[PDB]
Paper text:
We first determined the structure of Pseudomonas aeruginosa GCC (PaGCC) β subunit at 2.4 Å resolution. The structure confirms our hypothesis, showing that GCCβ has the same connectivity between its N and C domains as that of MCCβ. The overall structures of the two subunits are similar, with root mean squared distance of 1.2 Å for 464 equivalent Cα atoms between them, consistent with their strong sequence conservation. The overall structures of the two β6 hexamers are similar to each other as well, with root mean squared distance of 1.3 Å for 2,866 equivalent Cα atoms. While the connectivity in GCCβ is the same as in MCCβ, the linker between the N and C domains has a different conformation. In addition, the C-terminal segment of GCCβ (residues 526–538) contacts the N domain, while that of MCCβ contacts the C domain. The long helix at the N-terminal end of GCCβ is disordered in one of the three β subunits in the asymmetric unit, although this helix is fully ordered in the GCC holoenzyme structure. There is a large, mostly hydrophobic pocket at the bottom of the active site in GCC that can accommodate the larger geranyl group. Interestingly, the side chain of Phe191 in MCCβ is located in this pocket and clashes with the second isopentenyl group of geranyl-CoA. The equivalent residue in GCC is Gly162.
Author numbering:
A (entry chain B): 2 to 81, 89 to 216, 223 to 274, 278 to 461, 469 to 538
B (entry chain F): 52 to 81, 89 to 147, 152 to 216, 223 to 274, 278 to 461, 469 to 538
C (entry chain D), D (entry chain D): 2 to 81, 89 to 216, 223 to 274, 278 to 461, 471 to 538
Write the structure that this text describes.
């Protein structure tokens, strides 16, 4: 049952693949460092104020040496980076939570339209995986430039917070700072609010016809003792973070769970750096990736005889059974039928699905259409849409057009989706897009215009298809290093298994702050 | 052959009501989003009906095309309406495509929920557009017009009829269940599919006054713009059966109005603004919604507000916490929630009065209304102050004497309904018969049992 | 919308078909009467005892001119007929019940394998359709020929009675005669027992070291006054039936339902006698049957262009929306696929399914196999087996081999299955069977040209409707002209069951 | 607390009993082997083809030295043995499955009435006990002797497969040989099909106007590559079984369960050979059986003073708390009443029930009848039929007539029923039966003193354990000394089913 790798670790293919992937990883880890440097500018200006930086607060919030998975760290990159939020999934007092912090250190917070989207998305992760939501809030509010592309749709964040509370998923918010206008409802719709003495203020309209101090209009002490909008008053930031840990640590949260050994892979995950060809067009076997993420490198291959371009099978990752769907060519009618069936089978055995995209879309042509490519692809999509088992997507290569849909891309609601930095997501390949514009224009003509239309269109598309663009549009939950792929999937499966097992005390209207 | 609206005239029941939705979607954002859509009747069955508008530059689907399809799907799901679509159909597509998958995911789920989809293909449905019939339950194909393929002929050379014609799909592939001879025969066949379902037989079995004043002179009730604290009760009087209305907790707060009325036999509870929402109006409102959940009474939100009250008093008297409670009820209440934007809808006042992002079941706007993040009033103050103190009336009060009247002027209904901030604009004089129809839709859905299945109906 | 028939109304082949069909009806109808006749040749013994005959019992129990659907009247025709039971769905005091009387005018009641089988099936019908079970009992014991062979499996009937009580479906039993040995438990596991004085005895062992009058042992008065195994003491058969109506009449059974308009067909239902070729080998279009059962003769044909040999489509029957599946040729991969889709659609709309069987089975050959005939036939079976909507089968013709399965024959638990008299059910055609039996054994002199088409002639024994109804492969034969009103009645029953709430309990009602 | 046995351990009657019992075990065990023997007389034909024999297939599929409970090994012993099936509950990769292999070393697999029956019963066992169904298939078709008699009811097996898939109980099928005609649907309605290359064929009709290689028609490669009716292509029998383990091994099946310590009996279980009088007519105390199966030999006797002829009480078996009901005499009104109460109590505490049958049935006579024997027997049956807790039956002795019913014999759906070899199941004792048949006919010369006790001798044919196990009246015969570990294993299975959640779906998994 173990996969035989055909991979040459002291060879010219490998080393150049390692080279091109390390280039990509460094490439995105550089962009990350850049945001970090930009938030050391504010350090002294924070330290003047006796305030910890956002990531200093998280460092004190989180249990030391505990796994932390950060999400959408580059969301919104150059669209007006991280969306104004630092969020992730980690531990707070042995309780796995969705942890958030206004990135105050850059643009005093400020929340971009991709900030709306990221918040919506983190809320969906909190809901689906039943994670308590801990927020260290200190924000400027949304960019004034983007009222319209935000305002009405930004009510959904509040709607969600009201629903999370009724679902029985506790919200704890430390207000380190400003929480003004519309965004004062973010602590207002949390269950447990901590307010920092002197360095904190919530109100709908600030001072700038009545004349008032900010502390007297909506400062900490005002809330903790007059209006009752908070439950705890904290001295400073460290003490605020202490209290967030106290709260969390006083819930009997892990006690609600019921009470409930594996072989490592044959090949080391290090090797994943050289598995994808540097030559993007060059085919390879998704099983080479599988062999380095699966326990014992063991993969039970499903229906490979019927079709080899859509690869299905079973494996374990750190003990957890899953079903895998990956791509070694276009999705043919047979491939979609196989996949649909495989997904219903995993539904039947309560097996989580893992989708590794390297998809170029569906096979096309008269044979394909006459053999049911539409009807079979529809059934695959139906199966992905309707399966209730957890779906985990890893974009390892292509994610093109309807292949993206069929392999459980963002719009199909995977539990989690992460992308390799070599990956590409796009409505189609550049070459196909440009070719087609040539052809419809070749009739609706100067030969050079055609050539230029085709090729420019192509480079334009292929340029946009970069992982960076995908992740920046929240087409994924984040970029990961290929070598993290196994331990990431381990963590994510743990997350989904506990969610399945956890009972919640729901209520009609959400907890009422009387 | 027939045109978009000609198909619809023929699809729908002669003289049955028909409520059209987001007519002006995407107006000047480049209108109606590629789609003529609404709620009407086919063989006695109330459906969500939608037809490609190929006239207006071939239709197209685009940022508002996607929003409008997503929104219509939500309306079909929450109100349990069979979806009957007459389709025909790259500018925006690199950008929209990932999120565009939600339309397909929804189709798969709607099929699993037990709400059938009937699609007539009158023209080309290609690449991604091929999956909307794909993911329909009943598919009618028009002989020699319809074409379905993941890739049209634009390195094989095939004719488009050889590759995805009506006859290929009806006869060989099995992609469709019916072959129609022309536009009108497709439409007929769709009516017959609808008329052949036991849909209304799934429901259980089941008199009023009319208001005192005519409901046909109401183009004069609201002044031009809407910010004015003018009287929502005036409107209530014109919508409410026998103009009878029972003020609720009026004496506790005068500005946030609340009470019961009966529209066309249907009880409901109204939440209105004649002013800002103070911390008492909000408590009052949260309480009332909660009472309405208790008695299973539907909610009407008349938007005519500028936001919550502000000042040290409001903040001391718990405006955040009572506003929060009002949002909690708006969000978690299960009774249907109907919204009419009659005037101002600003800031967190739009949210708390159940504006779009609080998912009213249905939300409609008066042409005179204005939805927006804040007022020109507070705009020039922010722009000023965010450059001021981040020394003159040259670049202090010049910014407000301009920025006020940029937004306090532009802030059009039209932008809201184009951004899909509402489900359309309606003549204010239509408001009673409108709400009457929406309540009836909401009630039919409350009573309708569906037959769900695990994976959607498979077209094997 | 409507179907346009092309079968010549004043035709010749019509009149031919019409004559042949009428001959088959007359045949089985004749045979029904001869079981009535044999029962009537005990009017003296009954009249002497002062008893009503089973069918007089039933005519008094049933409502005046209400529909009454008799079930499995020829069951067990020759396997030693009707099982020793007369049963059906009719009306007692406005309530629709599963009604049953021991046929004690024939061999004195008495139960065999076929009687066990008919009883389990009746019990399934009541369970699935939520029908109060009214039983006019008078047997004694089972055929001693088979008792030892059968007594273990016979316990399932008692198991079912206990479970029916726990489901909240009342059982009313009038004991008109003897019910002794293990059959004492049939009244024993009923909820309401009426016991007729002087004529009625229940005990686990009759007189055959103690000596006793069978009345001292277990007569009506003993069970009503001393032991308390009965609830009502009736004076005579008529008084017993009377008490059974009054029990049904005092239930708020119809009050449990919620509260709740059609065109007739354009072509008279009488025409259904002359629709099926007199020559069964001739092929006909099933839509010609459809056009006489469907309101307005309207029929929406589904996916006909993908495969016209498995016909599907929608219709209304007395306003009831249904989906129909028929055969105009063998079942192809495409037809199976299509039918499986169609059943899923009907489930999705909560639309009942009608199966008109005229199959010879599935298409064969490398192409069929290559195109997925097994996988697709499999999906059609999955859909048939798992669909929640009511499934009604009318065997109108062929029902052979795997096509029998795929079209919701017995083993797939249709809710009801009635066969037309020309129908034929068999593992295959006699021709098909001889040939094969030739060619397999042929290569494992003159014995081919005869052993072949001699087995073919036999196989058309285990193949007439009669052998089918007798084996309980259908719930009865019916005159084709009843087909519309039949399905109407079945649809009503199915719809009422769907809507009806029941008061379950843990152990059944306890006769303390 | 403990029971104190008085059966002489170094006794004579013990040794007598012990010898007689051992003779009956040896008997049936011998007969089990002779079915193994007849299968082994095809090692050449298998070895030539390069096949593993059914039992080699099964030994490779099962986990090393895990328990394996074989079911209905003598089914159909002489009604033309084991059904053409070898089946049981054992372990595949840690998972407990219902495991089945076509017995294609005997008459080439092949299915009859008894094979239909054994299959429906296996399917019930899997459904009720939530066991993945692993099937190593190789048949061809059914006995052509019975195919036409049986093909309609045979569809129920396919119905069950479709429903098992919809329940969320996975079916894994390795096709080692042919599965043609209607039996193509057995792999067709399985969730995972493994098809062995070269040896394996599925088609609806084999070559016998088109001409084709059976491989062009439906061989492994065709179904795996072209049609897609299989999921895995195995090289050989061993490789197929291999793939079947790996499928089971990759399910998170045991991960679905929640997480979860006894005294042995004071008296060795071996002693159970010498507990039952060699002379069955002799009466014994059932507590002597109890004292060897119960932990600590402890037994809490329930309501013994009300009636000591129906014994009830509580015990633990490998820590499992159970309630037990046995027979030390016929069933009185008081004993029925008591047993019915006892079952209700066991339900209330969620305590499983063991039925040890040694009944001759119910008490008779005017007093019995007067004291409510029918009503009370009825309540006992209601309780047996309706109780939700697992019911396990061990036929240790007599199981006659209505006592068979009341003690949860076959027709009351015990979850499992195994019979000891001395056991006897019959509508009554042969003596009882002759006498009666005398006296009824006697008054309706020399023919009494012989027709009487000649029918008595016959009736002890339809009465040995063998005729019972062959008719599927039990799930198998078992060596009395296995009784404790048997019940242990059954209790575990029942407890795991209770606790196990399933992923239902609407139509079963679709092999698109």
């Amino acid at each position: 049952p173990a996969i035989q790798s055909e991979l040459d670790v002291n060879g010219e293919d490998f080393a150049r693949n390692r080279e091109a992937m390390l280039a990509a990883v460094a490439g995105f880890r550089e962009l990350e460092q850049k945001v970090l440097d930009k938030a050391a500018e504010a350090r002294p200006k924070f330290e003047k104020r006796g305030q910890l930086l956002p990531r200093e607060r998280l460092a004190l919030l989180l249990d030391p040496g505990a796994p932390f998975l950060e999400l959408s760290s580059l969301a919104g990159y150059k669209l007006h980076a991280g969306g104004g939020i630092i969020a992730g999934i980690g531990y707070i007092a042995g309780v796995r939570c969705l942890v958030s912090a206004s990135n105050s250190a850059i643009k005093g917070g400020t929340i971009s339209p991709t900030g709306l989207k990221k918040t919506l998305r983190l809320q969906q992760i909190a809901m689906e995986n039943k994670l308590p939501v801990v927020t260290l809030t200190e924000s400027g509010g949304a960019n004034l430039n983007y009222a319209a592309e935000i305002f009405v749709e930004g009510a959904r964040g509040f709607a969600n917070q009201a629903r999370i509370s009724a679902m029985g998923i506790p919200q704890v918010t430390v207000v380190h700072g400003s929480s003004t206008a519309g965004g004062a409802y973010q602590p207002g719709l949390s269950d447990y609010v901590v307010v920092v003495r002197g360095k904190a203020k919530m109100f709908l309209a600030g001072p700038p016809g009545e004349i008032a101090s900010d502390e007297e209009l909506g400062g900490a002490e005002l809330h903790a003792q007059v209006a009752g909008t908070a439950e705890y008053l904290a001295e400073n930031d460290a003490d605020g973070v202490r209290l967030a840990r106290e709260i969390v640590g006083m819930l009997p949260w892990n006690a609600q769970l019921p009470a409930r050994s594996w072989r490592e892979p044959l090949y080391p995950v290090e090797e994943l750096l050289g598995v994808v060809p540097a030559d993007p067009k060059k085919p390879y076997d998704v099983r080479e990736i599988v062999a380095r993420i699966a326990d014992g490198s063991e993969f039970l291959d499903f229906k490979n005889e019927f079709d080899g371009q859509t690869v299905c099978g079973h494996l374990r990752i750190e003990g957890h059974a899953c079903g895998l769907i990956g791509n070694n060519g276009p999705i043919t009618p047979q491939g979609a039928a196989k996949a649909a069936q495989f997904i219903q089978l995993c539904e039947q055995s309560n097996t989580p699905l893992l989708f590794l995209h390297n998809t170029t879309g569906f096979m096309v042509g008269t044979e394909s259409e006459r053999q049911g490519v539409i009807k079979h692809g529809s059934k695959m999509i139906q199966a992905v849409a309707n399966a209730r088992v957890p779906k985990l997507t890893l974009v390892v290569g292509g994610s093109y057009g309807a292949g993206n849909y069929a392999m459980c891309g963002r719009g199909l609601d995977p539990r989690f989706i992460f992308a390799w930095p070599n990956s590409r997501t796009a409505v189609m390949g550049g070459a196909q897009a440009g070719k087609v514009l040539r052809i419809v224009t070749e009739e609706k003509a100067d030969p050079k215009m055609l050539e230029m239309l085709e090729t420019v269109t192509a480079q334009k598309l292929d340029s946009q298809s970069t992982a960076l663009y995908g992740t920046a549009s929240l087409w994924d939950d984040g970029l990961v290093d290929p070598r993290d792929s196994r331990r990431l999937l381990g963590y994510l499966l743990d997350i989904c298994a506990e969610a399945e097992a956890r009972p919640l005390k729901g209520n009609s209207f959400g907890v009422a702050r009387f």
